[PDB]
Amino acid sequence: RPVHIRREGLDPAAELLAAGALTEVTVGSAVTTWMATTHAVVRQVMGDHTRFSTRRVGNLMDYDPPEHTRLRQKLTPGFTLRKMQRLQPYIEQIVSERLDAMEQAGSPADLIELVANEVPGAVLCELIGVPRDDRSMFMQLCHAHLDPRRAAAGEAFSRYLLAMIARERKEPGEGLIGAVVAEYGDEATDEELRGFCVQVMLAGDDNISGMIGLGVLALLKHPDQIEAFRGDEQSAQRAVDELIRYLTVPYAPTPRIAKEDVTIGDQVVKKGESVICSLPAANRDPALVPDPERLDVTRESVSHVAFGHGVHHCLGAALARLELRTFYTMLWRRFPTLALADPGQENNFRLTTPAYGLTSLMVEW
Numbered sequence: 001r002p003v004h005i006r007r008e009g010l011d012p013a014a015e016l017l018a019a020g021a022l023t024e025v026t027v028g029s030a031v032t033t034w035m036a037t038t039h040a041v042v043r044q045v046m047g048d049h050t051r052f053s054t055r056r057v058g059n060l061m062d063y064d065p066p067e068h069t070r071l072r073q074k075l076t077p078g079f080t081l082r083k084m085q086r087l088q089p090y091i092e093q094i095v096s097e098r099l100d101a102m103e104q105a106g107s108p109a110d111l112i113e114l115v116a117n118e119v120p121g122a123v124l125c126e127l128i129g130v131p132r133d134d135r136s137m138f139m140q141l142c143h144a145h146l147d148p149r150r151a152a153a154g155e156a157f158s159r160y161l162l163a164m165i166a167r168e169r170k171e172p173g174e175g176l177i178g179a180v181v182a183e184y185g186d187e188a189t190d191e192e193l194r195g196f197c198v199q200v201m202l203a204g205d206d207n208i209s210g211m212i213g214l215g216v217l218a219l220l221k222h223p224d225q226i227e228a229f230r231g232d233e234q235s236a237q238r239a240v241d242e243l244i245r246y247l248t249v250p251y252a253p254t255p256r257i258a259k260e261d262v263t264i265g266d267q268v269v270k271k272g273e274s275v276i277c278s279l280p281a282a283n284r285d286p287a288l289v290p291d292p293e294r295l296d297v298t299r300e301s302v303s304h305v306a307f308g309h310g311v312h313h314c315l316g317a318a319l320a321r322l323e324l325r326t327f328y329t330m331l332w333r334r335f336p337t338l339a340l341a342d343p344g345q346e347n348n349f350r351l352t353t354p355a356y357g358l359t360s361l362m363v364e365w
């Protein structure tokens with residue numbers, strides 16, 4: 001595995017943490033790819049949309065200002081703090097259902113297959129405005145276009161979502177697709193609102209799911225940390241942010257291509273040379289937080305780069321923190337005796353996803 005993808009258990013690869021803040025890999029005498037490993041470099045590179053590009057409808061990550069600005073402008077109004085707090089009741093119920101499914105399975109149980117791989121799509125479907133009746137189908141059609149062949153028919157997803165869009169066009173209601181139509185109507189192309197739907201589901205899935213499982217594993221391997229979720233919501237907020245920093249599920253963000261010769265410290269990234277930003281390494285930076293190798297939920301929140309930095313900052317960071325706080329809090333309320341069914345398992349990990357996670361995890365209700 002490459003160094004940036006290598007993870008030693010719940011932690012990233014030690015070699016990343018020992019590499020220079022801006023490591024230069026050159027294959028020639030000259031394809032030069034750079035790797036940012038510190039909090040300061042990662043922030044200068046992601047924060048500089050005037051010198052770095054993300055270009056290789058929808059998928060804001062592949063867009064640069066001013067095109068990225070216009071797109072993100074339409075969808076960003078639907079991610080405010082209050083807008084997300086209103087989704088909290090739905091989130092709670094979506095999780096309570098799978099927590100009820102947990103009791104139905106008894107003690108030995110793949111939390112991953114039961115809850116971690118279910119809660120994400122549910123909450124996301126609600127945010128978009130997908131009716132609870134027609135939901136699994138949408139999710140299944142999504143997992144279908146993934147071509148787990150060329151026969152993958154995502155045209156079904158396309159027209160189901162085109163129908164949802166045109167219905168909310170003639171009937172603006174609760175949801176992101178409806179909110180965008182309320183203020184933009186025809187100006188918001190069908191393809192645009194579609195690409196945005198695809199984007200939100202592909203970004204808020206493997207990340208949250210990865211955090212749902214890896215978080216429980218860590219909180220269970222370090223039982224002094226469960227207390228944060230048995231008290232104030234503030235005590236729990238600090239803990240979600242600590243877990244996000246420590247586990248940094250995204251290995252790296254979209255590669256940043258220099259649009260000109262950028263001087264980063266004593267080094268110079270040349271035009272065309274790309275920079276990979278190792279978020280997990282950056283969030284393990286002693287300049288960001290003292291004793292960065294430790295998992296301590298008592299820590300005061302810090303400006304980690306797990307949700308990004310700059311114009312492409314995660315549009316659902318607030319939702320991820322709320323969609324993870326409630327779960328942990330409820331998991332340790334319904335099953336306040338959970339442990340590792342196999343205290344001697346190899347913790348099967350997700351090594352194929354662009355986000356770290358557990359492919360399987362067996363608990364003991």
Ligand code: HEM
Binds near residue numbers: 061200201208308309
């Ligand atoms: C429901 C959950 C989530 C949604 C809806 C969501 C949505 C998004 C969207 C739309 C973007 C693109 C922003 C833009 O380019 O304008 C984005 C970027 C990003 N998200 Fe998420 N996200 C979610 C969860 C997470 C989680 C849990 C993490 C990390 C633990 C994460 C990490 C990131 C990062 C690092 C970026 C920036 C990537 C880059 O700059 O290229 N996201 N997210």
